Design a protein around this ligand. Structure first.
Ligand SMILES: *[C@@H]1O[C@H](CO)[C@@H](O[C@@H]2O[C@H](CO)[C@@H](O[C@@H]3O[C@H](CO[C@H]4O[C@H](CO)[C@@H](O)[C@H](O)[C@@H]4O)[C@@H](O)[C@H](O[C@H]4O[C@H](CO)[C@@H](O)[C@H](O)[C@@H]4O[C@H]4O[C@H](CO)[C@@H](O)[C@H](O)[C@@H]4O)[C@@H]3O)[C@H](O)[C@H]2NC(C)=O)[C@H](O)[C@H]1NC(C)=O
Ligand SMILES: *[C@@H]1O[C@H](CO)[C@@H](O[C@@H]2O[C@H](CO)[C@@H](O[C@@H]3O[C@H](CO)[C@@H](O)[C@H](O)[C@@H]3O)[C@H](O)[C@H]2NC(C)=O)[C@H](O)[C@H]1NC(C)=O
Ligand SMILES: *[C@@H]1O[C@H](CO)[C@@H](O[C@@H]2O[C@H](CO)[C@@H](O[C@@H]3O[C@H](CO)[C@@H](O)[C@H](O)[C@@H]3O)[C@H](O)[C@H]2NC(C)=O)[C@H](O)[C@H]1NC(C)=O
Ligand SMILES: *[C@@H]1O[C@H](CO)[C@@H](O[C@@H]2O[C@H](CO)[C@@H](O[C@@H]3O[C@H](CO)[C@@H](O)[C@H](O)[C@@H]3O)[C@H](O)[C@H]2NC(C)=O)[C@H](O)[C@H]1NC(C)=O
Ligand SMILES: *[C@@H]1O[C@H](CO)[C@@H](O[C@@H]2O[C@H](CO)[C@@H](O[C@@H]3O[C@H](CO)[C@@H](O)[C@H](O)[C@@H]3O)[C@H](O)[C@H]2NC(C)=O)[C@H](O)[C@H]1NC(C)=O
Ligand SMILES: *[C@@H]1O[C@H](CO)[C@@H](O)[C@H](O)[C@H]1NC(C)=O
Ligand SMILES: *[C@@H]1O[C@H](CO)[C@@H](O)[C@H](O)[C@H]1NC(C)=O
Ligand SMILES: *[C@@H]1O[C@H](CO)[C@@H](O)[C@H](O)[C@H]1NC(C)=O
Ligand SMILES: *[C@@H]1O[C@H](CO)[C@@H](O)[C@H](O)[C@H]1NC(C)=O
Ligand SMILES: *[C@@H]1O[C@H](CO)[C@@H](O)[C@H](O)[C@H]1NC(C)=O
Ligand SMILES: *[C@@H]1O[C@H](CO)[C@@H](O)[C@H](O)[C@H]1NC(C)=O
Ligand SMILES: *[C@@H]1O[C@H](CO)[C@@H](O)[C@H](O)[C@H]1NC(C)=O
Ligand SMILES: *[C@@H]1O[C@H](CO)[C@@H](O)[C@H](O)[C@H]1NC(C)=O
Ligand SMILES: *[C@@H]1O[C@H](CO)[C@@H](O)[C@H](O)[C@H]1NC(C)=O
Ligand SMILES: *[C@@H]1O[C@H](CO)[C@@H](O)[C@H](O)[C@H]1NC(C)=O
Ligand SMILES: *[C@H]1O[C@H](CO)[C@@H](O)[C@H](O)[C@H]1NC(C)=O
Lengths: 132, 462, 132, 132, 51, 52
């Protein structure tokens, strides 16, 4: 109404549209997070920090795989302690805002698991490249 | 049916931010002369549109008295203001033995114009010239340790040295439509009723805030926004006597202020380069300085506020007293109309107190009756209590006229154990933070946090 | 003469060599676009801006696919309104400088189309990953 | 003891563990190299330079392929002038620190070769895409 | 002469004022082009144009 | 000071005229200072006149 421009050029528009909505749109959000006497420092710091954050996130995506697709399967199963909801509930009723209030726990557990599944994959690939 | 984890980059979620915003100046105050315009020269002009969102179902918690942004606003004003006045007009040479005498005396409004003769350094440092400058009331202080003699001193000589103003610089509020840095966004409440805190329902996004014109004032706040539907009475804690009540009025009230006396201007070269400005002589007759306000509209306002105020203070009469007393900076209203500094005595503005029935009764009439306040002007002021940033105003010639549409109110509360049938309100103010808080409250600053997780069940072949 | 160093360490050397020439060389050009009291601000701003531009371009490449190859097929057909020349004319006679004077129109049309073909691909991939 | 955190959040911990050890760990090292009146310039310069170095390295990795895996085969054979050691000696006894003292020669030879094998691959891919 | 104007300075006595050529360089992302052409009226379509 | 013990002699009472809050007015004030900062005035002859 609105549309993608307002939703993601602008921000968070889909926050209320439930997370299944996101599957068709989480693109633009990323590109618009990388935009661009003493005030020169204030401005340079702001610019630099935005860049640093951006790049740090890209580094994590790289490490875990896959990673250029923005949506990746990392071949790590869910721990049952995190499976208290149905997928339909998660995707059709819950928002990212909402999910993120509870799934906020065990963040580093996931990151650890993602990093490690990739490390194992890479070794397996090198062994196959060596055999092949 | 085993669930597998996927990562989602770019999800629309956020967290509270603790960052800074920036100009976003209005891109209309820009012309060659912008270098002579305070708080515009330094800024970057922009012209962004309003945002459509509407985040739908999304609701959010706001809190006006916790929004740190106001401090950023305060701190920059102090520092921008101060920086803009560095390369000019140091007035230290003025602090010499000063000799002066009475106008005519007679009417108190004329007596004040003290002719003040003194010896000043000429373009040649060895040569000295005897010159006079017209000055009035407070800046001229009886010389310490004299005995009711013609010898006086400048007020700041026992303090720190002061400046005048770079004479070329314009000081007029320009709205700054503050914008977010990349990675951040601004949210705003479109809700009425909103007590200053709480779960706003329809909450729009903001790229850049609606611009807000900084104003230096107390008590009555001019050149501000209006409530959209009804008077809003807002306070951090209505039951805490130490807090100040902020009131947003629904309809405007008009204030007309002026300085009637034609005033001429002269300048004095002091040493090399820099000239000093002062009044030559008020050239006309000397009449009072005032602010016209319609009575009708003001008596309509006090009761309308009383009606809304009554909601939190039920079954009680609302009474309006005068300030507690103190220096004019404490008790008077302050204006910078025309660039001159006025201090206006509030009584009898808030003299009345209507029975807690607050009946909205009035009638049609051909009356043009007004309430008039009388004003006292100053030459040297401590800008925002900046004694260490003290400055002398440049004089302005001719007669000043000044509108406009007002007002926001700053009020406090009183009354002891000997009443509780009525409560007493007083004029209040002095903290610049509230002057901006009043409008800044609409916005909250958040950070976008991309990259989240969810199960999907789908798996990567590899 | 010259060679790649002067052409692309330095810039635009191939501009006169017609666009078919580019197929063997557009590499170095990219790497040399990422090089590195009050003058400190001037220099920091220059450095920061170069970085921001670089990264913003990378973000667009990412969004459209493919993207790490620098030359990618995006599986979007040409609109006939843009097909007023033969491929041989385009690749052997025209320069990038020259092409870019006319093909400059409809820039965002292309970008829109590229973004969308990728979005569709990603959904199709997720559906296949879900089935597989 | 130590572990990955001290070794690679901190730096160079594996330097003494011989290069075969690296095959399981060179991940974290990369992410922690991208971390974040007049002193404002000193700090901004430091931040900016760290970013520039990071990005320049990423650009080279991109150009040579493969490149998002951090460990890539580039299909370039070794020159016999560089084959004075057995692989077991290189991987089990030598450190990266040690290898790097001698293999330091001919750095640009390798880079040239890597860039070119990728350039040829890309042409071959385009020809196949054209045929297909 | 300057007493009726603004205050003046002399010179830091240690400082040398002698023209030193500055070979101005482009920032990354930019390049400089030059005309090697004679005849050139100060404007127009230079032919052999060096980087 | 008093002179006598070398450790007391050093406390030189040092009177001078200083600019007052009014630049035209001048006040005579004294500050206690000792040894090296107080230098016999150049070109005087063992007089009570000193310089900083
Ligand atoms: C802020 O608010 C204050 C009020 O709080 C306001 O002050 C008022 O300003 C107005 C400006 O017009 C003043 O109006 C003048 O008032 C005089 C006084 O007359 C009154 O009293 C006499 C008897 O004493 C009555 O007869 C008369 O009806 C009034 O009640 C008027 O006389 C003035 O009008 C005449 O004089 C003008 C020129 O001065 C003429 O142009 C006009 O035609 C009128 O002439 C009349 O008198 C002439 C005498 O020469 C005669 O020749 C004519 O034939 C005719 O009879 C005018 O109304 C008002 O008094 C002020 N009130 C007070 C007490 O201060 C401020 O102005 C306002 N400031 C703003 C605007 O910011
Ligand atoms: C403030 O005080 C000063 C004096 O320190 C007043 O200036 C003086 O004003 C008088 C009367 O206007 C001048 O006297 C006249 O001098 C002229 C020649 O200059 C002579 O022709 C006249 O016959 C008469 O004697 C006096 O010179 C002048 N002094 C100066 C130049 O400083 C000033 O008017 C007072 N201002 C106010 C508003 O009270
Ligand atoms: C509050 O808002 C009102 C309405 O905008 C302001 O009134 C304006 O005041 C300025 C003073 O700077 C006026 O500009 C002046 O114009 C005159 C020529 O008439 C010029 O000589 C001055 O030097 C200056 O440029 C402006 O015209 C006036 N606007 C209107 C329509 O009345 C008021 O200043 C604002 N602030 C306050 C304290 O009220
Ligand atoms: C606040 O408002 C009230 C009500 O207007 C003021 O009290 C009233 O003030 C008026 C004006 O002074 C009084 O009228 C005058 O009375 C005197 C004495 O009889 C008379 O000589 C004058 O000619 C005139 O008639 C009035 O009597 C007085 N009382 C009431 C109830 O009206 C009050 O003074 C105001 N206070 C402030 C803070 O200004
Ligand atoms: C350094 O020298 C100064 C003088 O330049 C000394 O100050 C002076 O001290 C004498 C004796 O205390 C004062 O005399 C007394 O004056 C008071 C009234 O002020 C009077 O009631 C006494 O009967 C006696 O005459 C003298 O006034 C004072 N001068 C001033 C105020 O500067 C100072 O004591 C010497 N300091 C040292 C540590 O040597
Ligand atoms: C709010 O949720 C309801 C029910 O899921 C949905 O129909 C509606 O479109 C949502 N509104 C927005 C704009 O998020
Ligand atoms: C100014 O100088 C004159 C002449 O030198 C002198 O008579 C007068 O007292 C001085 N006034 C002041 C206050 O310095
Ligand atoms: C300056 O003098 C005034 C008048 O006595 C006094 O109120 C003020 O405190 C003095 N300021 C200082 C710092 O001496
Ligand atoms: C918020 O609610 C008001 C109700 O009048 C509506 O006009 C407005 O459009 C809603 N949100 C926005 C975008 O202002
Ligand atoms: C209203 O304001 C009071 C403080 O004045 C605050 O405690 C309360 O949470 C606010 N919201 C409600 C529910 O009225
Ligand atoms: C204000 O309060 C004082 C007592 O502190 C009282 O004397 C005065 O009359 C009051 N003013 C009014 C009635 O507004
Ligand atoms: C303000 O006005 C009232 C009423 O005339 C007066 O009593 C009071 O002293 C005045 N205060 C000031 C600031 O002079
Ligand atoms: C200019 O174009 C001609 C004809 O295509 C070509 O033979 C020649 O090599 C080109 N020169 C350069 C260096 O671009
Ligand atoms: C040092 O080298 C020896 C022999 O390869 C090895 O056993 C030992 O673990 C190494 N120590 C470390 C911590 O590098
Ligand atoms: C200084 O005096 C000279 C000689 O009359 C004059 O030409 C010049 O304009 C004067 N400058 C000023 C600003 O008074
Ligand atoms: C208006 O309200 C005041 C109390 O604030 C009261 O004294 C006065 O009589 C009222 N006048 C009108 C217009 O009813």
């Amino acid at each position: 109404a609105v549309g993608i421009g307002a939703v993601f050029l602008g921000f968070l528009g889909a926050a209320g549209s439930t997370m299944g909505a996101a599957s068709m749109t989480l693109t633009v959000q990323a590109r618009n997070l990388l935009s661009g006497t003493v005030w020169g420092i204030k401005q340079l710091q702001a610019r630099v920090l935005a860049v640093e954050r951006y790049l740090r996130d890209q580094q994590l995506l790289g490490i875990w795989g896959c990673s250029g697709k923005l949506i990746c399967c990392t071949n790590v199963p869910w721990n049952s302690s995190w499976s208290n909801r149905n997928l339909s509930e998660i995707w059709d009723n819950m928002t990212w805002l909402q999910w993120d209030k509870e799934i906020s726990n065990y963040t580093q557990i996931i990151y650890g698991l993602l990093e490690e599944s990739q490390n194992q994959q890479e070794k397996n690939e090198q062994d196959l490249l060596a055999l092949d | 049916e085993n669930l597998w984890v996927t990562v989602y980059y770019g999800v629309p979620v956020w967290k509270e931010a603790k960052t800074t915003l920036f100009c976003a100046s209005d891109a209309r105050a820009y012309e060659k002369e912008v270098h002579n315009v305070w708080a515009t020269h330094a800024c970057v002009p922009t012209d962004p549109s309003p945002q459509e969102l509407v985040l739908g179902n999304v609701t959010e918690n706001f809190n006006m008295w916790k929004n740190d942004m106001v401090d950023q606003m305060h701190e920059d004003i102090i520092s921008l203001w101060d920086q803009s006045l560095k390369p000019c007009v140091k007035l230290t040479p003025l602090c010499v033995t000063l000799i002066c005498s009475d106008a005519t005396v007679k009417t108190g409004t004329v007596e004040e114009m003290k002719n003040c003769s003194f010896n000043t350094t000429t373009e040649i440092r060895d040569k000295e010239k005897k010159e006079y400058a017209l000055f009035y009331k407070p800046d001229i202080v009886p010389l310490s340790e004299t005995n009711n003699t013609s010898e006086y001193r400048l007020i700041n000589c026992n303090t720190s040295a002061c400046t005048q103003a770079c004479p070329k610089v314009t000081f007029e509020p320009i709205p700054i439509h503050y914008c977010a840095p990349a990675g951040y966004a601004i949210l705003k409440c479109n809700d009425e009723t909103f007590n200053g805190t709480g779960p706003c329902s329809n909450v729009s996004t903001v790229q850049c805030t609606h611009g807000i014109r900084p104003v230096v004032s107390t008590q009555l706040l001019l050149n501000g926004s209006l409530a959209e539907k009804e008077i809003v009475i807002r306070s951090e804690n209505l039951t805490n006597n130490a807090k100040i009540i902020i009131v947003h009025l629904h309809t405007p009230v008009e204030i007309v202020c002026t300085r009637p006396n034609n005033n001429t201007r002269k300048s004095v070269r002091i040493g090399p380069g820099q000239t000093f400005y002062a009044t030559g002589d008020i050239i006309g007759d000397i009449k009072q300085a005032h602010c016209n306000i319609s009575e009708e509209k003001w008596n309509d306002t006090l009761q309308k506020v009383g009606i809304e105020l009554q909601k939190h203070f039920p079954n009680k009469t609302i009474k309006y007293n005068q300030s507690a007393g103190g220096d004019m900076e404490i008790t008077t209203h302050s204006f910078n109309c025309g660039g001159e500094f006025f201090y206006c005595n509030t009584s009898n503005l808030f003299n009345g107190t209507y029975n807690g029935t607050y009946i909205s009764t009035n009638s049609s009439a051909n009356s043009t009756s007004t309430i008039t306040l009388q004003c006292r002007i100053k030459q040297i002021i401590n800008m925002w209590q900046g004694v260490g940033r003290c400055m002398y105003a440049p004089p302005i010639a001719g007669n000043i006229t000044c509108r406009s549409n007002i007002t926001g109110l700053l009020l406090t509360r009183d009354g002891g154990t000997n009443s509780n049938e009525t409560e007493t309100f007083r004029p209040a103010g002095g903290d610049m933070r509230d002057n901006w808080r009043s409008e800044l409250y609409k916005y909250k600053v958040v950070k976008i946090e991309p990259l989240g997780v969810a199960p999907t069940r789908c798996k990567r072949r590899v």
